[PDB]
Amino acid sequence: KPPKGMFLSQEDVEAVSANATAATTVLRQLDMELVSVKRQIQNIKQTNSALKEKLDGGIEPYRLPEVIQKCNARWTTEEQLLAVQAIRKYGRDFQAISDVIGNKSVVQVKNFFVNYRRRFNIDEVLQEWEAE
Amino acid sequence: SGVEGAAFQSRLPHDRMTSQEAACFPDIISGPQQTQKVFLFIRNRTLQLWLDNPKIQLTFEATLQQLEAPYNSDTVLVHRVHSYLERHGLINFGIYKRIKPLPTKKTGKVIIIGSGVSGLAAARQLQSFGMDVTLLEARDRVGGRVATFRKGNYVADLGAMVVTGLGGNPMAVVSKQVNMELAKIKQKCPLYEANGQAVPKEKDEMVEQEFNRLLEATSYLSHQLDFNVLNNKPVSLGQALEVVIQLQEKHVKDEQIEHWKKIVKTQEELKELLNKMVNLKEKIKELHQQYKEASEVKPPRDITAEFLVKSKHRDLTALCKEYDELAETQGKLEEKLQELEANPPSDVYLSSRDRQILDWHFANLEFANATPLSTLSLKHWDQDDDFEFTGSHLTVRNGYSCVPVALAEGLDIKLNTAVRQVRYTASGCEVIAVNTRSTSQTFIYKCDAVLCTLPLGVLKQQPPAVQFVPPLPEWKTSAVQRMGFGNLNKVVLCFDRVFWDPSVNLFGHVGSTTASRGELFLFWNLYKAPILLALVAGEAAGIMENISDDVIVGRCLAILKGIFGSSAVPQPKETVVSRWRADPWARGSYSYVAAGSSGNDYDLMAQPITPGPSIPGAPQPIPRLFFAGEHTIRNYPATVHGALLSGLREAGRIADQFLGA
Numbered sequence: 177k178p179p180k181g182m183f184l185s186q187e188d189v190e191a192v193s194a195n196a197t198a199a200t201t202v203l204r205q206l207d208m209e210l211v212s213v214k215r216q217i218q219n220i221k222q223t224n225s226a227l228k229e230k231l232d233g234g235i236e237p238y239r240l241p242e243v244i245q246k247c248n249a250r251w252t253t254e255e256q257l258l259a260v261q262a263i264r265k266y267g268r269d270f271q272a273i274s275d276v277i278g279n280k281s282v283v284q285v286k287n288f289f290v291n292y293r294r295r296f297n298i299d300e301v302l303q304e305w306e307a308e
Numbered sequence: 309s310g311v312e313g314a315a316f317q318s319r320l321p322h323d324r325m326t327s328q329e330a331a332c333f334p335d336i337i338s339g340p341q342q343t344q345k346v347f348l349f350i351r352n353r354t355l356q357l358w359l360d361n362p363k364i365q366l367t368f369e370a371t372l373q374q375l376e377a378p379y380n381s382d383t384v385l386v387h388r389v390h391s392y393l394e395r396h397g398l399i400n401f402g403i404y405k406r407i408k409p410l411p412t413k414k415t416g417k418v419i420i421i422g423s424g425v426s427g428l429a430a431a432r433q434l435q436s437f438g439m440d441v442t443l444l445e446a447r448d449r450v451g452g453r454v455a456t457f458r459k460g461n462y463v464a465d466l467g468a469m470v471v472t473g474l475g476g477n478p479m480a481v482v483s484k485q486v487n488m489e490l491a492k493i494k495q496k497c498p499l500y501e502a503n504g505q506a507v508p509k510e511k512d513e514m515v516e517q518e519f520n521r522l523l524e525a526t527s528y529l530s531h532q533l534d535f536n537v538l539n540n541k542p543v544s545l546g547q548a549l550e551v552v553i554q555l556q557e558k559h560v561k562d563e564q565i566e567h568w569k570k571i572v573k574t575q576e577e578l579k580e581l582l583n584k585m586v587n588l589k590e591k592i593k594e595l596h597q598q599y600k601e602a603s604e605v606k607p608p609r610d611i612t613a614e615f616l617v618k619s620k621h622r623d624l625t626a627l628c629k630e631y632d633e634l635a636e637t638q639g640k641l642e643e644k645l646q647e648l649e650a651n652p653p654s655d656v657y658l659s660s661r662d663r664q665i666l667d668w669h670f671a672n673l674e675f676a677n678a679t680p681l682s683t684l685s686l687k688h689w690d691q692d693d694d695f696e697f698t699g700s701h702l703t704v705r706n707g708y709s710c711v712p713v714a715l716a717e718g719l720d721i722k723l724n725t726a727v728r729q730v731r732y733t734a735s736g737c738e739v740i741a742v743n744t745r746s747t748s749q750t751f752i753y754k755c756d757a758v759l760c761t762l763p764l765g766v767l768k769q770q771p772p773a774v775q776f777v778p779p780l781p782e783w784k785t786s787a788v789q790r791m792g793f794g795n796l797n798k799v800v801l802c803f804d805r806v807f808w809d810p811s812v813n814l815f816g817h818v819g820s821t822t823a824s825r826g827e828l829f830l831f832w833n834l835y836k837a838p839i840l841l842a843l844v845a846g847e848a849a850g851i852m853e854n855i856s857d858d859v860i861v862g863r864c865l866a867i868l869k870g871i872f873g874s875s876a877v878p879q880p881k882e883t884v885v886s887r888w889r890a891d892p893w894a895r896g897s898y899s900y901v902a903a904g905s906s907g908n909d910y911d912l913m914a915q916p917i918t919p920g921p922s923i924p925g926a927p928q929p930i931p932r933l934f935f936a937g938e939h940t941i942r943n944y945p946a947t948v949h950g951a952l953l954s955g956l957r958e959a960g961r962i963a964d965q966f967l968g969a
């Protein structure tokens with residue numbers, strides 16, 4: 177029931193009146209606390225400003241052009257050999273494997289796993305990828 | 309309504325009997341509701357007839373002829389009600405033409421100390437009741453703290469000047485009996501900071517509102533946190549205001565710390581993100597170089613060389629996608645951080661100019677209570693608040709003294725007679741007084757009863773101005789110690805021409821420091837002739853009493869010259885400065901509810917003193933020493949109407965004692 181925007185907790189009233197010079201001590205430590213928070217903002221601004229200066233140039237010198245490839249249903253020998261290496265490197269990451277081959281959907285990759293499971297020792301190859 | 313208005317104008321509930329009435333009509337209040345309603349109508353209608361014409365005595369026969377059936381059937385009841393109203397001063401008080409001339413046989417002898425308003429009102433009553441009354445007055449005039457300066461056409465009140473609302477106010481009746489020129493006080497009151505410039509309306513209103521909110525806060529502090537004793541002493545209004553202000557200053561700092569901490573938290577979240585990006589950029593830079601080398605192994609290549617190009621390509625675009633998301637998050641954080649950097653909470657609770665204008669409002673409260681806020685009881689300082697009259701405040705244009713002078717007509721008043729000693733025993737009283745002009749002339753007044761209306765300041769005096777033999781009991785002297793008696797002074801400035809705003813009755817001067825906030829803080833334009841009154845309140849009151857009039861008037865003219873211009877303010881033709889604390893017949897201005905006191909001390913002040921028996925084993929004596937004055941009336945202290953009411957009370961009490969009820 178205090179007036180709106182007035183602030184009057186029992187806790188604070190006792191703190192400002194427990195002692196003859198309690199109030200000024202309270203407001204003093206709050207002042208110094210604000211000083212050390214502003215000091216700390218200055219350090220992080222200046223630290224972040226140096227980081228931004230390293231990101232000058234973005235990653236534009238390093239972005240490759242994006243090629244779209246018509247997703248083909250048929251597996252050339254070359255594309256099979258890519259997939260086996262992609263399995264060796266990426267494991268069950270069907271998306272990464274699709275991106276490496278370029279013309280094979282995530283489903284076609286997953287289907288490839290079963291059909292050539294036997295002939296390509298795909299189980300051995302997954303075990304091989306797990307050792308590192 | 310009419311009969312209902314009569315009750316309201318007599319400060320009575322119209323539909324209920326009071327404790328006083330219960331005491332004189334126990335048969336009626338303990339009896340059926342129907343008779344209580346009949347009683348209440350008789351009382352309200354008798355009050356009404358009196359109020360509708362307070363210039364002539366309302367007699368019992370007159371009253372009865374005006375009552376109509378069924379109410380005029382119980383003539384004993386009507387006569388009882390009329391006698392009760394008359395005896396207690398609710399009808400036939402003040403100055404009225406008497407139908408039946410006063411009987412020559414007087415009964416009992418009363419000495420009244422003091423011929424201020426309380427003393428005079430009691431005296432008129434007691435004489436109306438058939439008693440022999442003499443007033444002893446130390447000054448060379450009546451009125452006491454109603455004190456009007458008169459010189460030429462200049463008229464200005466050095467003491468009381470405001471009649472509060474007329475609704476319920478007994479001064480309403482008096483004003484129909486005396487030619488008082490009452491004039492409304494327009495409460496518009498511009499403030500001028502110490503540089504003579506006006507306070508902008510924006511600021512005048514902000515700070516006044518904050519002032520009202522700080523008061524509510526102290527009351528919350530009092531009633532909800534029970535912050536009423538601190539380090540074994542009663543908390544004062546001023547002290548509670550300090551705590552409230554300290555906490556508002558604390559909250560501003562708490563709010564700043566919370567705000568800059570949100571900025572730190574966000575900055576650090578951004579720092580962590582940038583480090584993530586810088587490392588990712590390097591990882592991307594190195595990966596590109598690898599994709600570049602592998603793709604420069606020119607075809608035709610075996611399928612592992614092809615896989616190297618295509619998987620470096622894949623790894624690089626993924627890292628680029630990761631980097632693009634981190635850079636989207638970076639722009640959102642820099643947004644959040646630019647909004648925070650633009651929403652800073654308030655810098656200060658009050659600026660210096662604010663706190664000065666605030667001090668003016670505190671000085672205004674120190675004026676109304678005639679005392680520094682550090683002396684007011686936090687718990688009780690506004691305890692008479694529920695009794696405020698209704699209507700506009702008014703000034704007495706022809707000088708408030710017209711009231712006590714009018715009341716004095718017909719009374720036996722010994723001016724220039726300072727009471728030195730009050731003697732009261734089971735057989736009667738002796739009042740010993742001296743001539744103030746030559747103190748060697750001693751006077752003895754013997755009487756059945758003494759009504760003491762000495763100001764609370766005089767009762768407080770150590771060593772005493774007035775000795776009571778036997779000494780007042782401790783329950784009364786302790787009350788006298790606890791009660792506050794404050795101080796307030798006025799500077800009357802009489803010019804030959806009006807240079808202020810004529811349509812503005814008040815204007816304020818905002819002092820530069822808290823210490824000086826009460827010093828000449830308020831000016832009044834109230835009179836027909838060009839007169840300004842300037843107030844000295846709070847801590848300034850007592851200090852300015854030890855400064856010469858020429859310096860005080862100088863400070864006044866300096867303030868006014870700053871507000872209105874140096875060429876606009878001529879020298880005053882006449883000036884007067886009050887020094888009420890130094891006045892030995894007052895020793896202050898009026899009472900206040902001090903920290904450590906309360907409303908019950910006003911009841912204690914009002915209680916009469918009863919001496920012990922002369923012969924031991926003799927029956928209980930009657931009371932002999934009575935008290936009236938503004939310090940004796942709980943619900944209307946520190947006013948003229950309170951003093952008048954207190955005299956009416958004591959006269960009923962004394963007459964009941966010595967004439968019988």
Ligand SMILES: Cc1cc2nc3c(=O)[nH]c(=O)nc-3n(C[C@H](O)[C@H](O)[C@H](O)COP(=O)(O)OP(=O)(O)OC[C@H]3O[C@@H](n4cnc5c(N)ncnc54)[C@H](O)[C@@H]3O)c2cc1C
Binds near residue numbers: 422447727
């Ligand atoms: C500056 C000032 C401004 C005020 N403002 C207002 C206002 O505008 N409106 C309002 O309603 N009230 C106001 N008041 C209060 C009001 O004036 C008083 O409450 C009231 O007039 C006092 O009445 P009283 O009869 O109790 O005391 P007083 O009028 O003080 O009567 C006591 C009398 O006893 C006399 N006396 C003292 N010592 C002795 C002695 N030893 N022997 C004999 N006689 C003695 C005194 O001289 C005096 O005449 C103000 C008071 C002051 C001083």
Ligand SMILES: O=CCCc1cc(F)cc(F)c1OCc1ccccc1
Binds near residue numbers: 467468469
């Ligand atoms: O000059 C005299 C003022 C003294 C005074 C003391 C009271 F206790 C009550 C009053 F009515 C009052 O007089 C008018 C007033 C009212 C409110 C604020 C300031 C003054």
